[PDB]
Tab-separated table of C-alpha atoms and ligand atoms in Angstrom:
chain	number	residue	atom	x	y	z
Y	4	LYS	CA	-39.116	2.831	-0.782
Y	5	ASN	CA	-35.799	1.003	-0.334
Y	6	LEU	CA	-35.259	3.249	2.694
Y	7	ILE	CA	-34.245	1.635	5.978
Y	8	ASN	CA	-35.514	3.389	9.105
Y	9	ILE	CA	-32.706	3.482	11.652
Y	10	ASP	CA	-32.173	5.421	14.887
Y	11	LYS	CA	-29.218	3.742	16.604
Y	12	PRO	CA	-25.569	3.002	15.753
Y	13	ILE	CA	-24.855	-0.104	13.683
Y	14	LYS	CA	-23.051	-2.289	16.220
Y	15	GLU	CA	-20.961	-4.509	13.963
Y	16	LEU	CA	-19.201	-4.397	10.624
Y	17	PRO	CA	-21.350	-6.435	8.218
Y	18	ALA	CA	-19.828	-9.566	6.673
Y	19	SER	CA	-20.298	-7.926	3.259
Y	20	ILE	CA	-17.411	-5.518	3.946
Y	21	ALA	CA	-13.902	-6.981	3.905
Y	22	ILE	CA	-11.096	-5.864	6.200
Y	23	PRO	CA	-8.209	-4.416	4.146
Y	24	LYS	CA	-5.086	-6.575	4.410
Y	25	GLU	CA	-2.100	-4.985	6.155
Y	26	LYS	CA	1.277	-4.839	4.418
Y	27	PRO	CA	4.023	-6.572	6.451
Y	28	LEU	CA	6.775	-4.471	8.016
Y	29	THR	CA	10.231	-4.311	6.449
Y	30	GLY	CA	13.385	-5.425	8.220
Y	31	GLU	CA	14.332	-1.937	9.385
Y	32	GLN	CA	10.738	-1.082	10.291
Y	33	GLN	CA	10.523	-4.227	12.428
Y	34	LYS	CA	13.777	-3.373	14.206
Y	35	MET	CA	12.549	0.119	15.066
Y	36	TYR	CA	9.182	-1.228	16.175
Y	37	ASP	CA	10.945	-3.571	18.593
Y	38	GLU	CA	12.786	-0.565	20.048
Y	39	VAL	CA	9.483	1.161	20.773
Y	40	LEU	CA	8.103	-2.041	22.292
Y	41	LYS	CA	11.169	-2.335	24.521
Y	42	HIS	CA	10.894	1.275	25.671
Y	43	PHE	CA	7.273	0.985	26.754
Y	44	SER	CA	7.673	-2.544	28.150
Y	45	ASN	CA	10.221	-1.348	30.724
Y	46	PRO	CA	8.675	-2.040	34.169
Y	47	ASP	CA	10.495	0.951	35.652
Y	48	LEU	CA	9.129	3.401	33.089
Y	49	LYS	CA	7.550	6.579	34.448
Y	50	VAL	CA	5.760	9.156	32.295
Y	51	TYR	CA	4.647	12.779	32.726
Y	52	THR	CA	1.270	13.271	34.399
Y	53	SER	CA	0.339	16.200	32.165
Y	54	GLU	CA	1.237	17.724	28.812
Y	55	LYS	CA	0.410	21.385	29.435
Y	56	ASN	CA	2.029	21.116	32.886
Y	57	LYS	CA	4.705	18.503	32.173
Y	58	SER	CA	7.319	18.290	34.926
Y	59	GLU	CA	10.381	16.110	35.414
Y	60	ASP	CA	9.449	16.185	39.104
Y	61	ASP	CA	6.115	14.478	38.480
Y	62	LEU	CA	6.363	11.147	36.690
Y	63	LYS	CA	4.114	8.143	37.251
Y	64	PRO	CA	4.263	4.529	35.993
Y	65	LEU	CA	1.902	3.101	33.390
Y	66	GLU	CA	-1.441	1.964	34.760
Y	67	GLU	CA	-3.130	-1.227	33.588
Y	68	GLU	CA	-5.488	0.726	31.298
Y	69	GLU	CA	-2.585	2.613	29.711
Y	70	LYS	CA	-0.772	-0.624	28.875
Y	71	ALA	CA	-3.974	-1.705	27.116
Y	72	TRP	CA	-3.853	1.467	24.998
Y	73	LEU	CA	-0.186	0.906	24.091
Y	74	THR	CA	-0.906	-1.668	21.406
Y	75	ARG	CA	1.013	-2.888	18.383
Y	76	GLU	CA	-1.131	-0.700	16.123
Y	77	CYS	CA	-0.764	2.293	18.435
Y	78	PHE	CA	3.016	2.023	18.053
Y	79	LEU	CA	2.620	1.698	14.291
Y	80	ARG	CA	0.311	4.705	14.031
Y	81	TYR	CA	2.948	6.874	15.715
Y	82	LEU	CA	5.859	5.337	13.815
Y	83	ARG	CA	4.192	6.186	10.508
Y	84	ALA	CA	3.162	9.665	11.665
Y	85	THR	CA	6.711	10.475	12.781
Y	86	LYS	CA	8.185	9.142	9.527
Y	87	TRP	CA	9.979	6.347	11.372
Y	88	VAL	CA	12.193	8.500	13.588
Y	89	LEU	CA	12.517	6.537	16.841
Y	90	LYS	CA	13.196	9.533	19.096
Y	91	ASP	CA	10.189	11.460	17.784
Y	92	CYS	CA	7.918	8.408	17.928
Y	93	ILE	CA	8.726	7.685	21.565
Y	94	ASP	CA	8.381	11.354	22.557
Y	95	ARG	CA	5.024	11.682	20.784
Y	96	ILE	CA	3.540	8.553	22.346
Y	97	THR	CA	4.798	9.757	25.713
Y	98	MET	CA	3.171	13.165	25.342
Y	99	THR	CA	-0.175	11.687	24.272
Y	100	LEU	CA	-0.124	9.463	27.365
Y	101	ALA	CA	0.481	12.667	29.328
Y	102	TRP	CA	-2.297	14.578	27.589
Y	103	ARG	CA	-4.797	11.731	28.035
Y	104	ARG	CA	-4.037	11.875	31.755
Y	105	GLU	CA	-4.472	15.643	31.938
Y	106	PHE	CA	-7.628	15.619	29.800
Y	107	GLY	CA	-9.418	12.936	31.793
Y	108	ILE	CA	-9.429	9.965	29.396
Y	109	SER	CA	-6.432	7.883	30.497
Y	110	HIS	CA	-8.522	5.021	31.921
Y	111	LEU	CA	-10.289	3.630	28.840
Y	112	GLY	CA	-13.716	4.564	30.114
Y	113	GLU	CA	-15.591	6.292	32.887
Y	114	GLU	CA	-16.084	2.793	34.299
Y	115	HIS	CA	-12.368	2.868	35.127
Y	116	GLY	CA	-12.280	6.445	36.402
Y	117	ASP	CA	-12.338	8.786	33.387
Y	118	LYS	CA	-13.411	12.327	34.277
Y	119	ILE	CA	-14.872	12.674	30.791
Y	120	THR	CA	-18.177	10.864	31.129
Y	121	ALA	CA	-21.110	10.376	28.789
Y	122	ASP	CA	-23.268	12.457	31.137
Y	123	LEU	CA	-20.785	15.333	31.083
Y	124	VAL	CA	-20.930	15.664	27.289
Y	125	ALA	CA	-24.405	14.309	26.461
Y	126	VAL	CA	-26.011	17.746	26.189
Y	127	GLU	CA	-23.570	18.628	23.394
Y	128	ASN	CA	-25.064	15.911	21.153
Y	129	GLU	CA	-28.739	16.700	21.792
Y	130	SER	CA	-29.204	18.187	18.308
Y	131	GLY	CA	-27.265	15.402	16.604
Y	132	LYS	CA	-24.368	17.576	15.432
Y	133	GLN	CA	-22.145	14.485	15.597
Y	134	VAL	CA	-23.284	10.980	14.700
Y	135	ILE	CA	-21.499	7.633	14.673
Y	136	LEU	CA	-23.263	5.407	12.152
Y	137	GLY	CA	-22.197	2.798	9.618
Y	138	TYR	CA	-18.984	1.629	7.979
Y	139	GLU	CA	-17.526	2.444	4.570
Y	140	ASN	CA	-15.861	0.471	1.760
Y	141	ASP	CA	-12.633	-0.169	3.666
Y	142	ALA	CA	-14.381	-1.089	6.934
Y	143	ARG	CA	-13.794	2.324	8.514
Y	144	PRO	CA	-16.464	3.414	11.003
Y	145	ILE	CA	-18.215	6.622	9.950
Y	146	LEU	CA	-18.440	9.795	12.018
Y	147	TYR	CA	-20.803	12.480	10.698
Y	148	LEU	CA	-20.014	16.101	11.520
Y	149	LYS	CA	-22.848	18.600	11.047
Y	150	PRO	CA	-21.567	21.997	12.260
Y	151	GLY	CA	-24.785	23.600	11.043
Y	152	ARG	CA	-26.590	21.917	13.935
Y	153	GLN	CA	-24.567	23.613	16.685
Y	154	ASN	CA	-26.686	23.731	19.842
Y	155	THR	CA	-24.315	25.099	22.487
Y	156	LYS	CA	-22.180	28.177	23.056
Y	157	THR	CA	-18.384	28.036	22.943
Y	158	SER	CA	-16.892	26.244	25.950
Y	159	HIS	CA	-14.301	23.666	26.971
Y	160	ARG	CA	-17.142	21.137	27.164
Y	161	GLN	CA	-17.426	21.361	23.387
Y	162	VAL	CA	-13.839	20.099	23.165
Y	163	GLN	CA	-14.517	17.351	25.701
Y	164	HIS	CA	-17.501	16.292	23.590
Y	165	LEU	CA	-15.465	16.159	20.369
Y	166	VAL	CA	-12.783	14.089	22.089
Y	167	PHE	CA	-15.412	11.784	23.620
Y	168	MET	CA	-17.018	11.182	20.221
Y	169	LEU	CA	-13.629	10.517	18.619
Y	170	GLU	CA	-12.888	7.997	21.358
Y	171	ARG	CA	-16.263	6.354	20.719
Y	172	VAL	CA	-15.740	6.006	16.979
Y	173	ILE	CA	-12.378	4.417	17.796
Y	174	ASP	CA	-14.242	1.955	20.044
Y	175	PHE	CA	-16.293	1.067	16.941
Y	176	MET	CA	-13.202	0.118	14.923
Y	177	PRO	CA	-13.680	-3.386	13.503
Y	178	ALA	CA	-10.871	-5.807	14.358
Y	179	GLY	CA	-8.217	-5.139	11.728
Y	180	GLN	CA	-8.976	-1.485	10.960
Y	181	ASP	CA	-7.783	1.566	12.908
Y	182	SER	CA	-8.710	4.563	10.747
Y	183	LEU	CA	-12.054	6.362	10.523
Y	184	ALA	CA	-14.114	8.063	7.847
Y	185	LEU	CA	-15.440	11.559	8.398
Y	186	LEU	CA	-18.512	12.780	6.556
Y	187	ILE	CA	-18.780	16.535	6.964
Y	188	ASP	CA	-22.032	18.296	6.073
Y	189	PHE	CA	-21.544	22.066	5.983
Y	190	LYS	CA	-25.238	22.765	5.351
Y	191	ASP	CA	-26.913	25.331	7.599
Y	192	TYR	CA	-29.764	23.807	9.601
Y	193	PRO	CA	-32.480	26.368	10.476
Y	194	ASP	CA	-34.530	23.973	12.615
Y	195	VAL	CA	-31.877	23.718	15.284
Y	196	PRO	CA	-32.485	26.883	17.346
Y	197	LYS	CA	-29.453	29.166	17.203
Y	198	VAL	CA	-27.599	29.893	20.434
Y	199	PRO	CA	-28.671	31.585	22.531
Y	208	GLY	CA	-9.015	29.459	22.584
Y	209	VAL	CA	-11.288	26.541	21.695
Y	210	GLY	CA	-10.150	26.408	18.085
Y	211	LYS	CA	-6.518	26.394	19.092
Y	212	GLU	CA	-7.074	23.600	21.609
Y	213	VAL	CA	-9.005	21.461	19.118
Y	214	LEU	CA	-6.271	21.992	16.537
Y	215	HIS	CA	-3.537	20.997	18.994
Y	216	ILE	CA	-5.353	17.805	19.956
Y	217	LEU	CA	-6.055	16.770	16.366
Y	218	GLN	CA	-2.556	17.541	15.116
Y	219	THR	CA	-0.769	15.956	18.062
Y	220	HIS	CA	-2.774	13.193	19.702
Y	221	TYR	CA	-4.620	11.262	16.990
Y	222	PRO	CA	-2.002	10.287	14.403
Y	223	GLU	CA	-2.987	8.142	11.418
Y	224	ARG	CA	-6.687	8.149	12.262
Y	225	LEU	CA	-8.075	10.017	9.239
Y	226	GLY	CA	-8.821	7.451	6.556
Y	227	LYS	CA	-11.179	9.520	4.420
Y	228	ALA	CA	-12.886	12.886	4.739
Y	229	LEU	CA	-16.081	13.183	2.687
Y	230	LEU	CA	-17.242	16.776	2.263
Y	231	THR	CA	-20.698	17.893	1.137
Y	232	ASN	CA	-22.950	20.968	1.066
Y	233	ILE	CA	-19.809	23.093	0.878
Y	234	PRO	CA	-20.544	26.854	0.888
Y	235	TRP	CA	-20.194	28.263	-2.619
Y	236	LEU	CA	-17.467	30.671	-1.530
Y	237	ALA	CA	-15.751	27.990	0.547
Y	238	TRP	CA	-15.815	25.588	-2.404
Y	239	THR	CA	-14.033	28.058	-4.668
Y	240	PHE	CA	-11.261	28.567	-2.125
Y	241	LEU	CA	-10.841	24.810	-1.642
Y	242	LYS	CA	-10.527	24.306	-5.399
Y	243	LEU	CA	-7.909	27.061	-5.608
Y	244	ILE	CA	-5.563	25.550	-3.020
Y	245	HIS	CA	-6.299	21.928	-3.930
Y	246	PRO	CA	-3.617	21.723	-6.656
Y	247	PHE	CA	-1.003	22.684	-4.062
Y	248	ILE	CA	-1.843	20.018	-1.472
Y	249	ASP	CA	0.420	16.992	-0.900
Y	250	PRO	CA	-0.661	13.865	-2.854
Y	251	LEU	CA	-1.139	11.697	0.253
Y	252	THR	CA	-3.407	14.319	1.797
Y	253	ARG	CA	-5.335	14.874	-1.433
Y	254	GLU	CA	-6.107	11.152	-1.476
Y	255	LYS	CA	-7.913	11.518	1.860
Y	256	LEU	CA	-10.225	14.282	0.652
Y	257	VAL	CA	-13.423	13.510	-1.224
Y	258	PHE	CA	-15.729	16.165	-2.645
Y	259	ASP	CA	-17.917	16.628	-5.724
Y	260	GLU	CA	-18.238	12.839	-5.933
Y	261	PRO	CA	-21.160	10.561	-5.078
Y	262	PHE	CA	-20.724	9.277	-1.519
Y	263	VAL	CA	-21.990	5.864	-2.660
Y	264	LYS	CA	-18.712	5.376	-4.517
Y	265	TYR	CA	-17.011	5.264	-1.117
Y	266	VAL	CA	-19.754	3.919	1.159
Y	267	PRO	CA	-22.161	1.001	0.651
Y	268	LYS	CA	-25.666	2.325	0.057
Y	269	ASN	CA	-26.984	0.416	3.087
Y	270	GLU	CA	-24.304	2.045	5.276
Y	271	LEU	CA	-24.967	5.626	4.166
Y	272	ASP	CA	-27.463	8.273	5.303
Y	273	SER	CA	-30.150	8.846	2.658
Y	274	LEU	CA	-29.511	12.593	2.890
Y	275	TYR	CA	-26.256	11.931	1.061
Y	276	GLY	CA	-27.443	9.300	-1.403
Y	277	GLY	CA	-27.663	6.221	0.808
Y	278	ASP	CA	-30.591	4.064	1.905
Y	279	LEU	CA	-30.450	4.733	5.647
Y	280	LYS	CA	-33.353	6.934	6.728
Y	281	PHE	CA	-31.850	8.356	9.900
Y	282	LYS	CA	-33.584	10.787	12.229
Y	283	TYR	CA	-31.714	11.838	15.351
Y	284	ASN	CA	-33.621	11.069	18.548
Y	285	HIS	CA	-31.342	11.782	21.512
Y	286	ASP	CA	-33.168	9.619	24.064
Y	287	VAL	CA	-32.844	6.603	21.773
Y	288	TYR	CA	-29.575	7.185	19.951
Y	289	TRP	CA	-27.383	8.406	22.812
Y	290	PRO	CA	-27.938	5.589	25.312
Y	291	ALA	CA	-27.479	3.072	22.484
Y	292	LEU	CA	-24.189	4.650	21.430
Y	293	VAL	CA	-22.925	4.743	25.006
Y	294	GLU	CA	-23.829	1.122	25.712
Y	295	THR	CA	-22.551	-0.221	22.392
Y	296	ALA	CA	-19.182	1.459	22.924
Y	297	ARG	CA	-19.088	0.325	26.563
Y	298	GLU	CA	-19.577	-3.310	25.531
Y	299	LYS	CA	-16.773	-3.027	22.989
Y	300	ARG	CA	-14.460	-1.575	25.644
Y	301	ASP	CA	-15.440	-4.291	28.130
Y	302	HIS	CA	-14.558	-6.969	25.581
Y	303	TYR	CA	-11.314	-5.273	24.573
Y	304	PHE	CA	-10.142	-4.967	28.176
Y	305	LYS	CA	-11.212	-8.487	29.125
Y	306	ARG	CA	-9.191	-9.848	26.192
Y	307	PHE	CA	-6.225	-7.678	27.213
Y	308	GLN	CA	-6.322	-9.145	30.719
Y	309	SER	CA	-6.784	-12.693	29.404
Y	310	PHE	CA	-3.585	-12.287	27.391
Y	311	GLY	CA	-1.393	-11.204	30.298
Y	312	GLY	CA	-2.235	-7.514	30.433
Y	313	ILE	CA	1.030	-6.579	28.740
Y	314	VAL	CA	2.072	-3.725	26.480
Y	315	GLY	CA	2.237	-4.457	22.767
Y	316	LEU	CA	-0.808	-6.674	22.250
Y	317	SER	CA	-2.592	-6.340	18.894
Y	318	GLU	CA	-5.959	-4.658	18.463
Y	319	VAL	CA	-6.788	-7.439	15.998
Y	320	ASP	CA	-6.531	-9.882	18.891
Y	321	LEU	CA	-8.147	-7.659	21.524
Y	322	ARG	CA	-11.213	-6.969	19.380
Y	323	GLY	CA	-11.615	-10.526	18.110
Y	324	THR	CA	-12.926	-13.752	19.654
Y	325	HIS	CA	-10.370	-16.277	18.367
Y	326	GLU	CA	-8.464	-18.265	20.984
Y	327	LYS	CA	-4.917	-18.140	19.606
Y	328	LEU	CA	-3.083	-14.824	19.277
Y	329	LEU	CA	-2.366	-13.683	15.729
Y	330	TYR	CA	0.318	-11.332	17.036
Y	331	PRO	CA	2.104	-12.863	20.046
Y	332	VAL	CA	4.286	-10.292	21.820
Y	333	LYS	CA	8.074	-10.327	21.462
B	401	B7N	C1	-18.825	23.261	19.210
B	401	B7N	C2	-17.721	22.255	19.277
B	401	B7N	C3	-16.558	22.618	18.351
B	401	B7N	C4	-15.522	21.492	18.431
B	401	B7N	C5	-14.387	21.712	17.472
B	401	B7N	C6	-14.892	21.070	16.175
B	401	B7N	C7	-13.943	21.089	14.980
B	401	B7N	C8	-14.733	20.382	13.855
B	401	B7N	C9	-14.056	20.012	12.687
B	401	B7N	C10	-13.033	19.055	12.546
B	401	B7N	C11	-12.438	18.289	13.525
B	401	B7N	C12	-12.347	16.893	12.970
B	401	B7N	C13	-11.564	15.991	13.867
B	401	B7N	C14	-11.477	14.638	13.216
B	401	B7N	C15	-10.496	13.865	14.018
B	401	B7N	C16	-10.233	12.476	13.463
B	401	B7N	C17	-9.058	11.872	14.236
B	401	B7N	C18	-7.892	12.852	13.933
B	401	B7N	O1	-7.499	13.615	14.822
B	401	B7N	O2	-7.369	12.889	12.647
B	401	B7N	C19	-6.351	13.903	12.433
B	401	B7N	C20	-6.717	14.636	11.142
B	401	B7N	O3	-8.052	15.187	11.194
B	401	B7N	C21	-8.402	15.828	10.019
B	401	B7N	O4	-7.609	15.889	9.063
B	401	B7N	C22	-9.805	16.457	9.895
B	401	B7N	C23	-9.819	17.666	8.953
B	401	B7N	C24	-10.012	17.277	7.477
B	401	B7N	C25	-9.978	18.537	6.617
B	401	B7N	C26	-11.363	18.979	6.164
B	401	B7N	C27	-11.230	20.263	5.349
B	401	B7N	C28	-12.580	20.779	4.874
B	401	B7N	C29	-12.385	22.081	4.106
B	401	B7N	C30	-13.716	22.638	3.621
B	401	B7N	C31	-13.495	23.962	2.881
B	401	B7N	C32	-13.776	25.182	3.780
B	401	B7N	C33	-15.226	25.229	4.284
B	401	B7N	C34	-15.458	26.458	5.166
B	401	B7N	C35	-16.906	26.502	5.661
B	401	B7N	C36	-17.155	27.730	6.538
B	401	B7N	C37	-18.606	27.762	7.022
B	401	B7N	C38	-18.869	28.989	7.895
B	401	B7N	C39	-4.935	13.299	12.295
B	401	B7N	O5	-4.547	13.277	10.901
B	401	B7N	P1	-3.868	12.001	10.208
B	401	B7N	O6	-3.646	12.323	8.779
B	401	B7N	O7	-4.692	10.815	10.542
B	401	B7N	O8	-2.449	11.869	10.961
B	401	B7N	C40	-1.387	12.765	10.623
B	401	B7N	C41	-0.552	13.105	11.878
B	401	B7N	O9	-1.392	13.695	12.876
B	401	B7N	C42	0.587	14.074	11.502
B	401	B7N	O10	1.360	14.375	12.665
B	401	B7N	C43	1.492	13.449	10.418
B	401	B7N	O11	2.539	14.363	10.076
B	401	B7N	C44	0.657	13.112	9.161
B	401	B7N	O12	1.486	12.528	8.152
B	401	B7N	C45	-0.489	12.133	9.523
B	401	B7N	O13	0.074	10.906	10.020
């Protein structure tokens, strides 16, 4: 049979998958990074409390949980996304801090006060339209998107759910990796009873507040018509972006068989069971956050700590702060 029956997220990256080595920063890159570190390490720093309602008359200092989010890799994700333009990098990080506050996810978990709770969005995942399961060849956690399993009508809660799931897959990042792999299944699922500015908001969030997170996007069951249109524009897409897109290729070339859903060629026989999968996902992510924050506090609770150190168990810091 070779099939492995599974119904819960795989908690840890298996030892069989190596963590890609990071290329050291150049002299100039290091200098600019230190400027970002200095900016956010300023004890008198105050940031907007909202993005959509930003006001110079309403600024508040960084909370403990926000300093824990402002990691070495966070700075690097924004520096790369902004093409190493200091001004733009600082402004972008600042606005994401503001948006996280406005959206209800600035506390690194409902356990610290987040308005976006698992209970608030749980109903949105009842049909398994989004699933966090497994890791691919470069240690990236996998997030499955199955739009054909839509179970709710358009609402802001749908956006809150997408953001919550994105935050959870980030919680699943193995120490040393900070990008994810998306596996999108466009197949229509007539088993999931049909129901009975969301698109613009989702677009804004994805294009503004999650820089350098897309490692790979695996597409399958692409509508015939849709496929043709993708193939027509494909030759005109930037090389770096083209390298992120995978279609018309066996998924097993990018994901270990024992880390891939059998529906797409893998050996994992996965059947979504909300009452089993959901609580497991919530608890697994919660434990990862608890560990991450405990480490953060153990290391002084300062801005600029490395996610490699926060998500690991080693005693000595691999990236001591300047
Ligand atoms: C009900 C709920 C609805 C919720 C709404 C649901 C919407 C569902 C679909 C997709 C949403 C997916 C979100 C995935 C988020 C992952 C985290 C994330 O936000 O990644 C972001 C990117 O996310 C994505 O790219 C996901 C989209 C991949 C494209 C897939 C195309 C598929 C095309 C298929 C052909 C057409 C099929 C049509 C089928 C029609 C069927 C009827 C950030 O990008 P990244 O490259 O990491 O960093 C950027 C940075 O940001 C820029 O500033 C910089 O300038 C640039 O250089 C880079 O640094």
